[model samples]
Target chain A: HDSGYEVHHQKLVFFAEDVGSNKGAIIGLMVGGVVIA
Target chain B: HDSGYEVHHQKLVFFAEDVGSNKGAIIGLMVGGVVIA
Candidate 1:
């Protein structure tokens, strides 16, 4: 399974928040653009 | 490349900074503990 493929990423903004909260905060995270939170 | 494996992550503080700056600021990025910046 050595197929030649590539993974791409960019500098983007990500937000963090607590569960059951009405609002959230913007923590400047200049890294990969994925919202797993 | 289909071997079974596991990826673990935790909530941790990550810091960011400018290259030519004298100091840095804590943005409070609570995510995986990796400093790829």
Candidate 2:
């Protein structure tokens, strides 16, 4: 269940509860309209 | 090719060149011995 993201200033961010500990080892964050890990 | 990660304070960090703009849309960051997205 993944939805793509775009960026705006000073708004709420969203991400999955996935972490490297369990299954999903990948994470993403939007910076300058780009998502970098 | 994927290798796992863990966290340490004030040291070199490593990640793939993958970004949302490319094929590998997923990214990850190490926080407190865990990787989060």
Candidate 3:
């Protein structure tokens, strides 16, 4: 195992959902999460 | 070098979908997958 370090990471989230049919039930939320880039 | 492990998750479901607008077709399903924390 050769150990060389190169870690690049990014995460940003803002998700919302309401998709329903057939009677209706669809809800989702993930307001925010961030790790610039 | 660090060695640590902790993994926990939980899920349970009955999913169905149909998004019909311009004629109609969207369907989805997933029963379950479990692990929790």
Candidate 4:
């Protein structure tokens, strides 16, 4: 369940075993957020 | 409402008036147990 995140002055990474099924989606808004992995 | 915010060593400012007889929304997530404004 590593999930994911953006690195400071770097790249981003994602890892999630929970969403290993068929399909998934990510979403966000003006206050900005993200679901990763 | 004039809902918005983001600041750094150089920028970021937000101002609000009202709902103006309408509707609006904003949202965010908290990391750890704090840091939400």
Higher-ranked by lDDT: 2 or 3: 2
Off by over 4 Å in 3: A1-27, A33-37, B1-5, B12-16, B22-37
Tens digit of per-residue lDDT, candidate 4, span A1-37: 1224321222223222232232223212133343332
Better of 2 and 4 by TM-score: 4
Candidate 4 stretches with Cα past 4 Å from truth are A1-31, A34-37, B1-8, B26-37
Best candidate according to TM-score: 4
- Candidate 3 structure quality by residue, lDDT tens digits, B1-37: 1112422232324333444322222223212332121
Residue range with the least summed lDDT across 10 consecutive positions in model 4 chain B: B22-31
> Which stretch of 10 consecutive residues in model 2 chain A shows the poorest summed lDDT?
A1-10
Candidate 2 deviant stretches above 4 angstroms = A1-9, A17-24, A30-37, B1-25, B28-37
Give one digit per residue, the lDDT tens place, for model 2 in B1-37: 0122422222323354423333233444422233333
lDDT of 2: 0.33
Give the per-residue lDDT digits (tens) of candidate 1, residues A1-37. Answer: 1123532232333443333322222345433453322
Model 4 residue B23 lDDT score? 23
- Interface RMSD (one decimal) of model 1: 13.5
Question: What tens-digit string does per-residue lDDT give for candidate 4 at B1-37?
Answer: 1212422233223332332221222222212232222
Candidate 3 DockQ vs. native: 0.05
| Candidates arranged by lDDT, highest first | 1, 2, 3, 4
